[PDB]
Amino acid sequence: MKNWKTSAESILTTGPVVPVIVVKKLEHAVPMAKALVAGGVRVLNVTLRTECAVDAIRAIAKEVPEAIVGAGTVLNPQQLAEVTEAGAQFAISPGLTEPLLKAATEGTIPLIPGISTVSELMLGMDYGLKEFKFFPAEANGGVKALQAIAGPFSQVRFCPTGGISPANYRDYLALKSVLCIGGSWLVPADALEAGDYDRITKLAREAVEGAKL
Amino acid sequence: AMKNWKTSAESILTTGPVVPVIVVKKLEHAVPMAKALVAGGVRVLNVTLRTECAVDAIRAIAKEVPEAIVGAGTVLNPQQLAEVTEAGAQFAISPGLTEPLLKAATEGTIPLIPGISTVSELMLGMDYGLKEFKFFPAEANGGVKALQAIAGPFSQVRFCPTGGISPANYRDYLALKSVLCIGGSWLVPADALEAGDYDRITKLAREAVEGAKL
Amino acid sequence: MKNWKTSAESILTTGPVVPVIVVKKLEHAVPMAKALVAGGVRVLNVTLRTECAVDAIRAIAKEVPEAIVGAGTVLNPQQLAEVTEAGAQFAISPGLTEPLLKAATEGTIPLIPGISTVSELMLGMDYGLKEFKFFPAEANGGVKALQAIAGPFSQVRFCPTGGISPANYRDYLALKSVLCIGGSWLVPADALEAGDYDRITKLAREAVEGAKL
């Protein structure tokens, strides 16, 4: 369609890890985003799981130009339009539907939607998509399930999210079908609550360095 | 809530912790089985559309055991939904969902609690305004862990897991914030039903309700 | 179906095993097919995963008329029409979509489409289909899923494919709802390279003989 100035592939290839951010207090959003950027992680998935999420996207979009901020847990076109208005550069959804795929592909920012099954992958491909989230990765059957799901589809690429942490993320990054992974461990709720931005920066840098090799 | 439904789907699931999955082969067993379950404290009766007499069983239970909340399970399309609604079903359960079934349900008069296995299926149900779902088949879907992850991004949705749930594991599911109740076939064993062993059915229902307590 | 002279059920009941074929070099297609047929395996799922696949289907159709040759990894109506014109006698898809289901039921050859979940099964049944692939079987929950996924659906029948080999194919073939299984083990990539047609015939013969319950 030509509609997306930012490609979905560019979002997934910026770096190896995309943090799944749950931010309860708005005041934490900008220092958190700066702390991630300082650790070399700069694609920020702010999930629509808290009241302040869209305001957090808006603030990060304005105040942290070194980050590419987007929205996650986007379930429907209403939410897609909200995050587009607020300054999200991309949208992540935990699964897909036709109204969401239609609104996204007609709209101005890339959607990287989750799938669990090949039928869901095929419906996304019918809308021209080739980059997907694999969610919930561990509950979908992990690396092996992803290897089987990805096999008939040489060209498709994934961002697995759900149950991924330093213990297992390399297993996913090793796969030819995987561009990057998502996880909430880079932004733990207790770190945000305690204002331990220093620890967020270290978690980010540990993730980036640990992804190599 | 759904403007066309007089009974909410939520109220169906919050009635009790266990919903028996009923397969009734011979019509004459349906009413005494329903009374036996009610007598054991279990009144939401999922009469599955897996046998020829299922719809007549729903009608019989609706007439003779009006204190039960009788409904239909294994509802696969709008035709079956209309048929069970006409018969007196107070709700419908489906093992999975489709857009024609969702549309017919929301235009019709009784709550549908449809099965999902994945978040995309959940999202399709949510597009139609639904917030109460079955999680089927629960154990083969990846059980409590799967359900935990799937239900994660979806804090308002509630489930009734069904499929491989037993007295051995049902409290594992009932302990989850996202779960209101579970479904199981163990309350109405095929052999008890054919034997007319209603005291056994009552005992099992009573044990299920007591054992659900955390 | 009055549009499908060759029923989906006839394809799946021909034998216990359907090889998932990836043919990288066209010249190997015909002797591979003859080797399978010599070992007693006649239904050949030639997957659309390599450039020469459609030419492989045309070659096998001409030269090995006892092979029942079909196309796999059929993802959309365009590919379905292409393989139909090339002489495929059936099509297999790893999942399903409404455009693919509509095209299949409008066309002349049976589609046996993959499902992973009951909602996907219900969508296929809404188009009148009663035979399905269960893919990727191991990732879908395996035998326990079919005892359960197939539960409320006593009449539906399957061809499980994905992670099935001699170690477990009998576990699937034991099920009332299973007509046959699929797998790539019968045509190992390196056997084709090495021109080891004897190896292919032996694996086929072993698979058919090992299937007797």
Q: Are C126 and B163 a contacting pair at CB < 8 A?
A: no
CB neighbour list of residue A209: distance below 8 Å, 6 or more residues apart: none
d(CA A211, CA B7): 53
Q: Please report, to the nearest 10 degrees, the dihedral formed by the alpha carbons of residues B81, B84, B89, B91 taken in order.
A: -20
What residue type is A67 in one-letter code? A
A165, A14, A20: which is closest to A92 by C-alpha?
Answer: A20
Which residue in the set C75, C95, C138 is minimally distant from A117, CB to CB?
Answer: C95
d(CA B84, CA B111): 12
Technique employed here was: X-ray
A39 is written with which tokens?
A: 């650790």
**Interface residues from chain C to B (CB-CB < 8 Å):** 116-123, 125-126, 141-142, 144-145, 148-149, 151-154
Rounded CA-CA distance C178/C12 in Å is: 9
Measured between beta carbons, which residues in chain C are less than 8 angstroms from residue A149?
A: 136, 139
Residue C186 tokens read as: 């019968």
Is residue C136 reached through a cis peptide bond, with omega within 30 degrees of 0 on the bond before it? yes
Residue-wise DSSP of A110-170: -EEEEESSHHHHHHHHHTT--EEEETTTTTTTHHHHHHHHHTT-TT-EEEEBSS--TTTHH
For residues C119 and B117, what is the distance between their CA atoms, to the nearest angstrom? Answer: 8
Distance of CA C24 to the CA centre of its chain: 18
Q: Which of A29, A33, A28, A110 is nearest to A65 (CA)?
A: A33
CA–CA gap between residue A34 and residue A56 (Å, rounded): 13
Q: How many CB atoms neighbour CB C117 within 10 A?
A: 29
Whats the size of chain C, residue-wise?
213
C-beta separation of B28 from B51 below 8 A: no
Test mutation, B136, B139, B162, B169, chain C, max C CBs within 10 A: B136
| Three-state SS letters, chain B | CCCCCCCCHHHHHHCCCEEEEECCCCHHHHHHHHHHHHHCCCCEEEEECCCCCHHHHHHHHHHHCCCCEEEEECCCCHHHHHHHHHHCCCCEEECCCCHHHHHHHHHCCCCEEEEECCHHHHHHHHHCCCCEEEECCCCCCCHHHHHHHHHCCCCCCEEEEECCCCCCCHHHHHCCCCECCEEECCCCCHHHHHHCCHHHHHHHHHHHHHHCCC
Q: What DSSP assignment string belongs to A33-70? A: HHHHHHTT--EEEEES-STTHHHHHHHHHHH-TTSEEE
Q: Is A152 in Cβ contact with C94 (below 8 Å)?
A: yes
CATH of the domain at B200: 3.20.20.70
Which residues, 6 or more positions from A155, have their beta carbon under 8 angstroms from its beta carbon? A130
The residues with which A45 forms a beta bridge, in sequence order, are A20, A70
If one counts the domains in chain C, the total is 1
Burial code (b: 16+ CB inside 10 Å, e: under 16) for B73-88 equals bbbbbbebbebbbebb
d(CA B13, CA B162) in angstroms, rounded, equals: 12
Expressed as residue numbers, the domain containing A114 is 1-213
B182-184/C17-21 β-pairing: unpaired
The rounded distance, in Å, linking the Cα atoms of C145 and B50 is: 18
Q: C162's torsion region: left (phi>0), alpha (psi -120 to 50) or beta?
A: left
**Residue type at C36 in one-letter notation:** L
Minimal Cβ distance to C96: which of A116, A119, A154 = A119
CB B130 within 8 A of CB B112: yes
Residues 6+ apart with CB under 8 A from B144: B172, B173, B176
Among candidate residues B169, B171, B172, B97, the one with its CA nearest the CA of residue B132: B97
Amino acid B65 reads V
* Residue burial C23-33, b: 16+ Cβ < 10 Å; e: rest: beeeebbbebb
From chain B, pick out residues whose CB is under 8 angstroms from the CB of A49. 153, 155
In this complex, do C118 and B117 lie within 8 Å of one another by their Cβ atoms? yes
Helix (H, G, I), strand (E, B) or coil at C100: helix
Q: How many beta-carbon pairs under 8 angstroms link B with C?
A: 61
Can the peptide bond before residue A188 be classed as cis, meaning omega within 30 degrees of 0? Answer: no
Backbone angles phi, psi at A74, to 5 degrees: -85, 115
Identity of the residue in B77, B100, B117 whose CB atom sits nearest the CB atom of C117: B117
Residue B21 vs residues C36, C39, C75: alpha-carbon distances, Å: 46, 46, 37
Q: Which of A24, A111, A135 is best to mutate for the B interface (most B CBs within 10 A)?
A: A135
How many other CB atoms are there within 10 angstroms of residue B90's CB atom? 22
How far is residue A182's CA from residue A134's CA, in Å, rounded to a whole number?
9
Rounded to 5°, the CA angle C83-C100-C78 comes to 40
Nearest-CA distance C109 → chain B (Å):
25
Q: For the purposes of burial, counting CB atoms within 10 Å of the CB of C6, is it exposed (0-12), middle (13-18) or buried (19 or more)?
A: middle
